[PDB]
Amino acid sequence: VYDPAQARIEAESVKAVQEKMAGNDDPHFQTRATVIKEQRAELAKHHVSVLWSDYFKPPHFEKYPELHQLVNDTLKAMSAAKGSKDPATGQKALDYIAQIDKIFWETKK
Amino acid sequence: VYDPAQARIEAESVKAVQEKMAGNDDPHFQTRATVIKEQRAELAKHHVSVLWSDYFKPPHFEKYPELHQLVNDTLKAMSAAKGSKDPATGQKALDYIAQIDKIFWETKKA
Amino acid sequence: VYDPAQARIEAESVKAVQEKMAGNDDPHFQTRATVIKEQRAELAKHHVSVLWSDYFKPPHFEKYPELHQLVNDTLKAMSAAKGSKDPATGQKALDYIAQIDKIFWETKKA
Amino acid sequence: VYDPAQARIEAESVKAVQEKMAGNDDPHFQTRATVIKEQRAELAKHHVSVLWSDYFKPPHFEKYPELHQLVNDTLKAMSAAKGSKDPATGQKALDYIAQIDKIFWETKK
Amino acid sequence: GVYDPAQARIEAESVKAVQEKMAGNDDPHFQTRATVIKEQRAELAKHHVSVLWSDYFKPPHFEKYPELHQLVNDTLKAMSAAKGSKDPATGQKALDYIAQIDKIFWETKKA
Amino acid sequence: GVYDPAQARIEAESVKAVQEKMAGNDDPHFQTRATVIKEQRAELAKHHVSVLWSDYFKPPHFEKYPELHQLVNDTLKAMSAAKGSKDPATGQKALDYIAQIDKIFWETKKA
């Protein structure tokens, strides 16, 4: 059922929207890309938060003690991106989702 | 950016919920699982629709004359699964999404 | 029960918001109206989609071979309106919905 | 922009779902029709509440003094229907929306 | 289940909090984000206020307090004005209105 | 804008309120409606608790209170158990957990 792919696609969409904000400076487009970035950001946050609450059971946290702070930093990096036009912040959020994805599949093997 | 993975994952939750409905008889669980199935089914229907309306542009409908119908047959297979406890109806929906995933990537490479 | 009135009313909010964007220059209002236009546009797109997936059954697609495309052209006309301040793009979307409303009722009588 | 047609279609859907609950007694269908009835009911309530807050301006209330309690009774009748399997409660909610619709069009003339 | 205007107050306190942050800044991005947040939080403030009126407040509450109907409407309208404005004063007018509904709320929990 | 666990508490108080109404009744319709409401309100309780953890609580709050991370996870999981159960005791376990996060919340508003 669970997959971090839903967090990736929404966060891949945040960076995509940020790259497009650089090559167009029209007020209407800027506003629209801010409305979509806020929605896609909160959705990415939800999917990451769900992985932490509903999937990762108590023995997983005893196995990877840094997981708790990682999920928090992932959510926080995504909130920074939600507030930024810089694609690097969206990529920081993607790099943070990749770390969770690595740990996620290491619990399916 | 789009990816039919969003539809598949939500459709995979439907078949998984249908299967959990056969190993438990408790009225409260049957009720909860029905609510969840109704939620993920309409979410899967949303993701399939969005692909069709926002991703798939006119050159794709000319290259794939069957695409229009494949999407409608998926949305209806998923509506069937939404009102069925049978894991097969959910597996039928997943198989239609698999046909959309194949066409999707053939338009991403070249 | 279904009715394309739900799509038309939300699409009518889009054209009305586009028109209000031409008589005011205030940055805050342009911003608010853009947010609202993005909201009602996707709501209109939802109502058009739901007609196509849940109401329109296979005998309708055989009777109207152009229905599949009419719905996709509406969803795209509405996506154009969503990213345009031009009242015409919103009126183009309303005109496509009007073609869906005509076909809708022809299948309700007989 | 505003139209009570959105409240009608959702409340016409509540009565429709209640009629179908009478001709089928299978636990799965009953649960599904309860999930759809709860959603369609809250949506009907929202559209009626919006007509009252966003459309009807202060001179309209000075013109029809019974409007305030009508909108409340409409919302309450719809909450009774949300809780009932009886189609008559859904029709009571529809009859109450018809009264608002009558007053609505009498403000457009 | 359980109702409380504290839900309406917090989403309405968010509208004023956003309007105060819009005064010291000028950045096209920050201004836009605040408007998106103000539109959503004001619409949520309007939902909670409407819920108390329909779902919580029963018919005798309308006889005992005849002013309640017009008060809830003026709160919802004040919250629409706050949604449309950038001025913290219109956001505070809605908090003043919610405070009045809050006073009537706890009076009925005593009844 | 402004955060408060009172949002999490009320949606979590609704879960227990629903579970108590499920005990005295047996009606197939009333039982179903309560389950739909319990699923929605518990999922909303889980949202607010998650929001406080990511959006409100900053990094020094995690150093000062090292137990916070596991507490929020156990609250979210306790709320998942309440969502799955009909017993008011599991709905109260989540209120006990939220009460602990509430204590830590007001301590940081003093800091």
Check if the beta carbon of residue A42 is closer than 8 Å to that of residue A13: no
The whole-angstrom separation of Cα F46 and Cα E51 is 21
Residue of E4, E7, E14 lying closest to F2 (CB–CB): E14
A18 touches A41 (CB < 8 A):
no
Domain containing residue E28: CATH number: 1.20.120.400
Q: Considering only CB atoms, which chain E residues are within 8 Å of A20? A: none
Angle at which helix C5-20 crosses helix D5-20, to 10 degrees, equals 160
Question: What one-letter code names the amino acid at E62?
Answer: F
* Owning domain of residue D90: 1-109
Q: How far is CA C49 from CA B83, C77, C82, E67, F74, in A?
A: 19, 13, 16, 44, 40
User: In sequence order, what are the residues at sequence separation of 6 or more whose Cβ sits closer than 8 angstroms to the Cβ of residue D33?
Assistant: D17, D20, D21
The whole-angstrom separation of Cα D17 and Cα D35 is 10
**Contact partners of C by the rule of 3+ C-beta pairs under 8 A?**
A, B, D, E
- Measured at the CA of B58, the angle between CA B56 and CA B64, to 5 degrees, comes to 75
In total, the C-beta contacts within 8 angstroms joining chain B to chain F are 16
How far apart (Å, rounded) are the C-alpha atoms in residues E30 and E23? 11
Label residues D11-43 b or e (16+ Cβ within 10 Å = b): bbbbbbbbeebeeeeeebebbbbbbbbbbbbeb
Joined together, the tokens standing for residue D92 give 């009571």
Rounded to 10 degrees, what is the CA torsion of B22, B28, B34, B40?
-100
One-character DSSP codes across D21-75: TTS---HHHHHHHHHHHHHHHHHHHHHHHHIIIIIS-HHHHHH-TTHHHHHHHHH
Token reading at F81: 């158990």
- Breakpoints of chain B, after residues (C–N > 2.5 Å): none
Q: Which of D68, D10, D19 is nearest to D39 (CA)?
A: D10
Give every CB contact of residue E8 below 8 A, 6+ residues apart in sequence: E45, E48, E49, E52, E98, E101
* Neighbour tally for C69: CB within 10 Å: 12
List chain D residues with CB under 8 Å of B85: 28
Tokens of C17: 């918001």
Cβ contact, residue pair B30, D29, below 8 Å: no
Q: Find the discontinuities in chain F where C to next N exceeds 2.5 angstroms and give the residue preceding each.
A: none
Structure tokens given for E75? 């709160």
Rounded CA gap, E86 and E30, in Å?
13
Q: Which tokens sit at F37?
A: 């409401």
For residues A42 and A79, give the distance between their C-alpha atoms in angstroms, rounded to a whole number: 8
Neighbours of F102 (CB within 10 A): 17
Min Cα distance A3 → chain F (Å) is 19
Q: Both tokens of residue C1?
A: 């029960």
Q: Which of E72, C73, D34, E67 is nearest to B53 (CA)?
A: C73
The size of chain B, in residues, is: 110
> What token pair was written down for B6?
């969003």
- Chain D segment 30-69 residues within 8 A of B by beta carbon are 31-32, 35-36
Alpha-carbon distance of A25 to A28, in angstroms, equals 9
Its sign, for the CA torsion B83, B85, B89, B91, is positive
Instruction: Return the number of other C-beta atoms located less than 10 Å from residue E27's C-beta.
Output: 10
Q: How far apart are CA A42 and CA A52, in angstroms?
A: 15
Nearest Cα residue in chain F from D82: F33
Q: Compute the radius of gyration of chain A from its Cα atoms.
A: 15
Q: How far apart are the first and last CA of chain B?
A: 17
Residue E108: closest CA among E47, E58, E72: E58
User: Resolution in angstroms for this experimental structure?
Assistant: 2.8
Q: Name the residue of chain F whose CA is nearest to A82's CA.
A: F55
**B90: closest CA of chain A, how far (Å):** 13
- What is the Cα–Cα distance from A17 to A79, expressed in whole angstroms? 15
The torsion of the CA quartet A40, A44, A50, A51, rounded to 10 degrees, works out to 150
Q: Is C70 exposed, middle or buried (0-12, 13-18, 19+ CB in 10 A)?
A: middle
What residues in D contact C1, CB-CB < 8 Å?
9, 12-13, 16
Q: How many domains does chain C have?
A: 1
Distance, CA of B10 to CA of B43 (rounded, Å): 7
Give, as one character, the DSSP assignment of residue F46.
Answer: H
- Verify C-D touch: 3 or more CB pairs within 8 A: yes
Which residues in chain D have Cβ-Cβ distances shorter than 8 Å to F33?
Answer: 34, 38, 82-83
